[PDB]
Motif scaffolding. Structure first.
Motif, PDB file in Angstrom:
ATOM      1  N   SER A   7       0.755  -1.214   0.000  1.00 19.52           N
ATOM      2  CA  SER A   7       0.000   0.000   0.000  1.00 19.52           C
ATOM      3  C   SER A   7       0.799   1.283   0.000  1.00 19.52           C
ATOM      4  O   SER A   7       0.278   2.418   0.000  1.00 19.52           O
ATOM      5  CB  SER A   7      -0.839   0.075   1.331  1.00 19.52           C
ATOM      6  OG  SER A   7      -2.052  -0.592   1.035  1.00 19.52           O
ATOM      7  N   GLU A   8       2.111   1.150   0.142  1.00 18.52           N
ATOM      8  CA  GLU A   8       2.987   2.321   0.165  1.00 18.52           C
ATOM      9  C   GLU A   8       2.764   3.218  -1.039  1.00 18.52           C
ATOM     10  O   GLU A   8       2.888   4.412  -0.765  1.00 18.52           O
ATOM     11  CB  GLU A   8       4.437   1.899   0.359  1.00 18.52           C
ATOM     12  CG  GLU A   8       5.516   2.736  -0.281  1.00 18.52           C
ATOM     13  CD  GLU A   8       6.780   2.823   0.562  1.00 18.52           C
ATOM     14  OE1 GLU A   8       6.875   2.175   1.633  1.00 18.52           O
ATOM     15  OE2 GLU A   8       7.690   3.578   0.144  1.00 18.52           O
ATOM     16  N   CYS A   9       2.500   2.733  -2.236  1.00 13.78           N
ATOM     17  CA  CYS A   9       2.260   3.623  -3.399  1.00 13.78           C
ATOM     18  C   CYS A   9       1.008   3.049  -4.043  1.00 13.78           C
ATOM     19  O   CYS A   9       1.078   2.131  -4.862  1.00 13.78           O
ATOM     20  CB  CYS A   9       3.510   3.541  -4.262  1.00 13.78           C
ATOM     21  SG  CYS A   9       3.558   4.230  -5.921  1.00 13.78           S
ATOM     22  N   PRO A  10      -0.192   3.442  -3.608  1.00 12.85           N
ATOM     23  CA  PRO A  10      -1.414   2.803  -4.061  1.00 12.85           C
ATOM     24  C   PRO A  10      -2.138   3.458  -5.216  1.00 12.85           C
ATOM     25  O   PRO A  10      -3.247   3.021  -5.538  1.00 12.85           O
ATOM     26  CB  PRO A  10      -2.212   2.833  -2.727  1.00 12.85           C
ATOM     27  CG  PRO A  10      -1.956   4.294  -2.362  1.00 12.85           C
ATOM     28  CD  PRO A  10      -0.461   4.513  -2.613  1.00 12.85           C
ATOM     29  N   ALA A  65       1.584   9.879  -8.534  1.00 14.97           N
ATOM     30  CA  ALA A  65       0.454  10.106  -7.606  1.00 14.97           C
ATOM     31  C   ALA A  65       0.594   9.145  -6.449  1.00 14.97           C
ATOM     32  O   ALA A  65       0.588   9.471  -5.241  1.00 14.97           O
ATOM     33  CB  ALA A  65      -0.852   9.890  -8.366  1.00 14.97           C
ATOM     34  N   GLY A  66       0.859   7.867  -6.770  1.00 15.58           N
ATOM     35  CA  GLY A  66       1.073   6.888  -5.692  1.00 15.58           C
ATOM     36  C   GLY A  66       2.257   7.277  -4.794  1.00 15.58           C
ATOM     37  O   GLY A  66       2.201   7.007  -3.606  1.00 15.58           O
ATOM     38  N   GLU A  67       3.345   7.854  -5.306  1.00 15.23           N
ATOM     39  CA  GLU A  67       4.484   8.234  -4.481  1.00 15.23           C
ATOM     40  C   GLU A  67       4.138   9.447  -3.626  1.00 15.23           C
ATOM     41  O   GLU A  67       4.539   9.490  -2.472  1.00 15.23           O
ATOM     42  CB  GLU A  67       5.719   8.614  -5.338  1.00 15.23           C
ATOM     43  CG  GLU A  67       6.087   7.484  -6.303  1.00 15.23           C
ATOM     44  CD  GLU A  67       7.416   7.708  -7.008  1.00 15.23           C
ATOM     45  OE1 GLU A  67       7.813   8.882  -7.157  1.00 15.23           O
ATOM     46  OE2 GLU A  67       8.082   6.714  -7.391  1.00 15.23           O
ATOM     47  N   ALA A  68       3.417  10.396  -4.185  1.00 12.05           N
ATOM     48  CA  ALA A  68       2.947  11.522  -3.363  1.00 12.05           C
ATOM     49  C   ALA A  68       1.934  11.073  -2.317  1.00 12.05           C
ATOM     50  O   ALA A  68       1.783  11.725  -1.267  1.00 12.05           O
ATOM     51  CB  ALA A  68       2.353  12.615  -4.266  1.00 12.05           C
ATOM     52  N   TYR A  69       1.155  10.029  -2.534  1.00  9.37           N
ATOM     53  CA  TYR A  69       0.085   9.613  -1.600  1.00  9.37           C
ATOM     54  C   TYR A  69       0.581   9.236  -0.237  1.00  9.37           C
ATOM     55  O   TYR A  69       1.207   8.201  -0.105  1.00  9.37           O
ATOM     56  CB  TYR A  69      -0.713   8.472  -2.240  1.00  9.37           C
ATOM     57  CG  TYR A  69      -1.993   8.067  -1.538  1.00  9.37           C
ATOM     58  CD1 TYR A  69      -2.020   7.307  -0.395  1.00  9.37           C
ATOM     59  CD2 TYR A  69      -3.218   8.429  -2.124  1.00  9.37           C
ATOM     60  CE1 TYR A  69      -3.220   6.945   0.192  1.00  9.37           C
ATOM     61  CE2 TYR A  69      -4.427   8.099  -1.537  1.00  9.37           C
ATOM     62  CZ  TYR A  69      -4.416   7.341  -0.382  1.00  9.37           C
ATOM     63  OH  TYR A  69      -5.597   6.991   0.223  1.00  9.37           O
ATOM     64  N   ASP A  70       0.299   9.978   0.828  1.00  9.43           N
ATOM     65  CA  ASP A  70       0.748   9.625   2.159  1.00  9.43           C
ATOM     66  C   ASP A  70      -0.380   9.662   3.182  1.00  9.43           C
ATOM     67  O   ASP A  70      -0.148   9.786   4.393  1.00  9.43           O
ATOM     68  CB  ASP A  70       1.904  10.522   2.653  1.00  9.43           C
ATOM     69  CG  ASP A  70       1.406  11.962   2.768  1.00  9.43           C
ATOM     70  OD1 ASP A  70       0.334  12.288   2.237  1.00  9.43           O
ATOM     71  OD2 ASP A  70       2.102  12.781   3.380  1.00  9.43           O
TER      72      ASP A  70
HETATM   73  K   LIG Z   1       3.552   7.034  -1.093  1.00  9.86           K
END
Ligand SMILES: [K+]
Ligand code: HEM
Ligand SMILES: CC1(C)[C@@H]2CC[C@@]1(C)C(=O)C2
Length: 404
Positions: A73-76, A82-87
């Motif tokens: 789920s780290e980059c979903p 977008a997944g890398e920015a998602y926190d």
């Molecule tokens: K992330």
């Protein structure tokens, strides 16, 4: 279109674009389910949106959501940036870490709170519908689908209603980007908004959802301001972009199917079973995971770092999961779906969503039992992380309605 990676075999390439699918004019659910034709494998690679795997069947979606050691789920989100920015918390964490944050989140949006909000949900749905009743017409997306779920969310969060245009604009750029903002700019604009609020309610704790999160405990220790913000942002998107879209798919269908309206008017105790069936047929979310290591799954070599979209929408659409899946049947005996997710991240807002859906159908059909799509309208759907309806013009004869 992106360069097909060395490890991906040519025979599994299926160039599906989740933000603008080829058969979109047939219905977004219909567009997505091209991936379930006889010609298509159980697991494809798409070159669109930077490239990513796509599981197409319910069997693989469920297995992958359960296996968090390989499907992280780290980059979903897709695209990769977008997944890398998602926190967001808890959605960007994997168990065991993820688990303590769910019970803080459960306290602001779970059943206990659906029970505090019970009167107000009922009241706003009656009062919105009664105001539209005499007109004989509405622009449903704008006149009910948005304001009903949205004003309940702002009420629970203790946020003012004229912040709605700004927050829905931003939340919507994170699921259905129009091009003006990147997922990260959108996200940082949501945090910027939440920052003063969070700090103010940490000095003067109140009763609202933001205060509860911000002054909350996580397995016995105090939550930090950065964790509060990351959990808070996630609740807003869930509040402003899930049920809002879902209600429009369900009302479009009811407007096109007089016999299904009749079933619910005749036996209103069938409303909860019908809500479930509609949640399967008009399923609308598709997020996914990232591979933690090299891995072989159902005969395909996956590579550490690969992204994989596991469309939650596709599982109840699967003919292997439900017979004649495109047909809506309120007496369907085993309604199988993954609409609210699967595995350890099962939707925390599903009890709130189901209540809002059942209250809307009962209260609409009570007052406006007969209604149709306005003459000559062709409904357009939109695709993304969360799918939806661009506009829904409905018409009715006021002589057939009742002020209740
Ligand atoms: K992330
Ligand atoms: C029709 C309505 C909704 C649908 C279809 C839906 C669907 C989902 C799905 C598929 C997930 C898991 C995603 C993943 O595993 O990456 C999820 C998680 C979540 N949703 Fe819902 N959602 C809905 C409504 C809501 C609402 C109304 C709220 C709150 C206002 C909400 C709050 C949450 C939260 C907090 C999580 C995170 C769970 C976790 O990461 O542990 N959702 N939702
Ligand atoms: C995939 C989702 C529906 C789930 C709740 C909101 C959403 C966009 C996330 O970011 C988590």
């Amino acid at each position: 279109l992106a360069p097909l990676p060395p490890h991906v075999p040519e025979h599994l390439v299926f160039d599906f674009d989740m933000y603008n699918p080829s058969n979109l004019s047939a219905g977004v659910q219909e567009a997505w389910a091209v991936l379930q034709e006889s010609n298509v494998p159980d697991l494809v690679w798409t070159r669109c949106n930077g490239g990513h795997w796509i599981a197409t069947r319910g069997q693989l979606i469920r297995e992958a959501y359960e296996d968090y050691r390989h499907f992280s789920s780290e980059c979903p989100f897709i695209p990769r940036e977008a997944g890398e920015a998602y926190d967001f918390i808890p959605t960007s964490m994997d168990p065991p870490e993820q688990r303590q944050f769910r019970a803080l989140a459960n306290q602001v949006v779970g059943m206990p709170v659906v029970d505090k909000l019970e009167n107000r949900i009922q009241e706003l749905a009656c009062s919105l519908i009664e105001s539209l009743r005499p007109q004989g017409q509405c622009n449903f997306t704008e006149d009910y689908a948005e304001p009903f779920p949205i004003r309940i969310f702002m009420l629970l969060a203790g946020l003012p209603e004229e912040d709605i245009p700004h927050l829905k604009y931003l939340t919507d750029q994170m699921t259905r980007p129009d091009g003006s903002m990147t997922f990260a700019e959108a996200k940082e604009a949501l945090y910027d908004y939440l920052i003063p609020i969070i700090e103010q309610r940490r000095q003067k704790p109140g009763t609202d959802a933001i205060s509860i999160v911000a002054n909350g405990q996580v397995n016995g220790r105090p939550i930090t301001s950065d964790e509060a913000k990351r959990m808070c942002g996630l609740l807003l998107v869930g509040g402003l972009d899930t049920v809002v879209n879902f209600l429009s798919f369900s009302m479009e269908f009811l407007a096109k199917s007089p016999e299904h309206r009749q079933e619910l008017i005749q036996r209103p105790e069938r409303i909860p079973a019908a809500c479930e069936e509609l949640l399967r047929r008009f399923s609308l979310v598709a997020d996914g995971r990232i591979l933690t290591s090299d891995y072989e799954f159902h005969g395909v070599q996956l590579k550490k770092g690969d992204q994989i979209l596991l469309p939650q929408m596709l599982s109840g659409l699967d003919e292997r999961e439900n017979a004649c899946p495109m047909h809506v049947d309120f007496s369907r005996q085993k309604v199988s779906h993954t609409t609210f997710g699967h595995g350890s991240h099962l939707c925390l807002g599903q009890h709130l969503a189901r209540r809002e859906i059942i209250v809307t159908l009962k209260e609409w059909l009570t007052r406006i039992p007969d209604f149709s799509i306005a003459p000559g309208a062709q409904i357009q759907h939109k695709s993304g992380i969360v799918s939806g309806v661009q506009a829904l013009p409905l018409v009715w004869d006021p002589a057939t309605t009742k002020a209740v």
